[PDB]
Ligand binder design. Sequence first.
Ligand SMILES: *[C@@H]1O[C@H](CO)[C@@H](O[C@@H]2O[C@H](CO)[C@@H](O[C@@H]3O[C@H](CO[C@H]4O[C@H](CO[C@H]5O[C@H](CO)[C@@H](O)[C@H](O)[C@@H]5O)[C@@H](O)[C@H](O[C@@H]5O[C@H](CO)[C@@H](O)[C@H](O)[C@@H]5O)[C@@H]4O)[C@@H](O)[C@H](O)[C@@H]3O)[C@H](O)[C@H]2NC(C)=O)[C@H](O)[C@H]1NC(C)=O
Ligand SMILES: *[C@@H]1O[C@H](CO)[C@@H](O[C@@H]2O[C@H](CO)[C@@H](O[C@@H]3O[C@H](CO[C@H]4O[C@H](CO[C@H]5O[C@H](CO)[C@@H](O)[C@H](O)[C@@H]5O)[C@@H](O)[C@H](O[C@H]5O[C@H](CO)[C@@H](O)[C@H](O)[C@@H]5O)[C@@H]4O)[C@@H](O)[C@H](O)[C@@H]3O)[C@H](O)[C@H]2NC(C)=O)[C@H](O)[C@H]1NC(C)=O
Ligand SMILES: O=C(O)Cc1cccc2ccccc12
Ligand SMILES: O=C(O)Cc1cccc2ccccc12
Ligand SMILES: [Zn+2]
Ligand SMILES: [Zn+2]
Lengths: 160, 160
Amino acid sequence: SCVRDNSLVRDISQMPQSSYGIEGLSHITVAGALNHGMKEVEVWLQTISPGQRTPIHRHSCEEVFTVLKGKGTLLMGSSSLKYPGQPQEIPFFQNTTFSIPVNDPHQVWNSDEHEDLQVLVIISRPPAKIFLYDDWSMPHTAAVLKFPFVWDEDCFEAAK
Amino acid sequence: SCVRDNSLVRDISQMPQSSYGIEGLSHITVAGALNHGMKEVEVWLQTISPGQRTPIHRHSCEEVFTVLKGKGTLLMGSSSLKYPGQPQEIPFFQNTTFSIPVNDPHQVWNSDEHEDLQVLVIISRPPAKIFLYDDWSMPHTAAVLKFPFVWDEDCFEAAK
Ligand SMILES: *[C@@H]1O[C@H](CO)[C@@H](O[C@@H]2O[C@H](CO)[C@@H](O[C@@H]3O[C@H](CO[C@H]4O[C@H](CO[C@H]5O[C@H](CO)[C@@H](O)[C@H](O)[C@@H]5O)[C@@H](O)[C@H](O[C@@H]5O[C@H](CO)[C@@H](O)[C@H](O)[C@@H]5O)[C@@H]4O)[C@@H](O)[C@H](O)[C@@H]3O)[C@H](O)[C@H]2NC(C)=O)[C@H](O)[C@H]1NC(C)=O
Ligand SMILES: *[C@@H]1O[C@H](CO)[C@@H](O[C@@H]2O[C@H](CO)[C@@H](O[C@@H]3O[C@H](CO[C@H]4O[C@H](CO[C@H]5O[C@H](CO)[C@@H](O)[C@H](O)[C@@H]5O)[C@@H](O)[C@H](O[C@H]5O[C@H](CO)[C@@H](O)[C@H](O)[C@@H]5O)[C@@H]4O)[C@@H](O)[C@H](O)[C@@H]3O)[C@H](O)[C@H]2NC(C)=O)[C@H](O)[C@H]1NC(C)=O
Ligand SMILES: O=C(O)Cc1cccc2ccccc12
Ligand SMILES: O=C(O)Cc1cccc2ccccc12
Ligand SMILES: [Zn+2]
Ligand SMILES: [Zn+2]
């Protein structure tokens, strides 16, 4: 569904959450472009189950994560050579933050075997324009744009 | 002193908090322009003590709040009158979100007597350009710009 709501105070617990077909994910856009009218920043609340990973991807915007619960590993590559290259792998834990430089290819993995990972994610220039890589050797020109992304599809179609 | 941190993954409990001379405030810039190099978004973590309030102010950027703990009241003024005017009082509670229209005058109040209010705040176009009002009756044209703001003064002076 597309749930639009521009009032000023909104209850996060009442904004319908979904995996959008991504196994192990639970997503809520807390404040965003297509659902609420934002123009410069957008905020997501996401929970990833044990062992799950996001796809390898990039987006031409700033992006900041804050870890509410759980632990994991951040994988990041470079945006300057013709492909991402073998990534940096950096562990993170509850109450850590990390920002992804514009266009850097990255992946977030919930490497804990038992607890869910819950983060707040903030982006600039919404909505997100995510290009997907199938592995760290795929060249940057070859990444596939998936726009709108699955949590924006219903509202993107409703706004034409 | 100015604390600059060029690290990718940071522990938020080790970024130094301060009131910056604002009674009942505790602030940490989680990811920002002067402290970490951000250009498009900046993220703060703020705790306000029971009864305390931010000054009445406005800023030419988007601003989104997410309430992590506690509860309170958002006070919103007019951007169409020549002054903010008597404010609308909008209650908010744990797990709510609110976005402040660009340039609207507002104040956040911890109207709870029992527990601290903690919020994650996101702004666009950092660092903040905050104009202060002495009361809801002050004309928009008389509001005073305080730049750099108190949590940016040390790095702004160090930058020279
Ligand atoms: C991730 O890590 C984060 C960082 O560690 C965590 O957030 C922090 O959580 C702390 C633990 O709960 C939390 O500590 C509480 O701070 C509040 C809020 O504080 C201020 O006001 C206090 C109370 O005030 C009044 O009385 C005073 C005398 O009693 C008067 O002086 C005053 O004017 C007023 O009327 C003040 O005592 C306090 O003041 C000072 O403290 C500053 C340091 O904060 C100094 O700069 C200053 O000189 C002086 O020492 C504050 O201004 C308290 O009310 C409460 O009892 C705890 O101290 C802290 O605030 C949180 N930080 C932020 C930025 O939010 C977070 O929880 C972690 N999250 C996860 C998921 O793990
Ligand atoms: C502020 O409000 C927030 C919103 O209410 C709240 O955050 C919510 O908190 C709840 C409670 O803790 C969380 O619920 C937890 O969700 C996790 C993770 O869920 C996802 O993964 C599970 C497990 O997946 C895998 O295992 C299954 C087998 O069981 C496989 O099929 C699968 O492939 C994987 O291997 C999965 O079952 C979930 O899927 C279902 O649910 C989604 C909806 O989320 C449907 O769309 C889907 O079709 C299906 O029914 C999902 O993919 C779960 O494991 C836990 O058991 C528990 O349910 C929410 O995740 C969380 N929401 C967000 C967005 O983070 C805040 O906590 C609250 N905060 C405060 C301060 O109060
Ligand atoms: O922008 C990010 O890194 C978040 C993110 C981007 C793309 C796909 C995702 C799937 C599941 C969870 C998060 C995801
Ligand atoms: O509404 C805001 O921009 C945050 C904010 C702006 C100005 C002063 C403040 C004092 C204490 C806590 C937050 C404050
Ligand atoms: Zn990303
Ligand atoms: Zn403000």
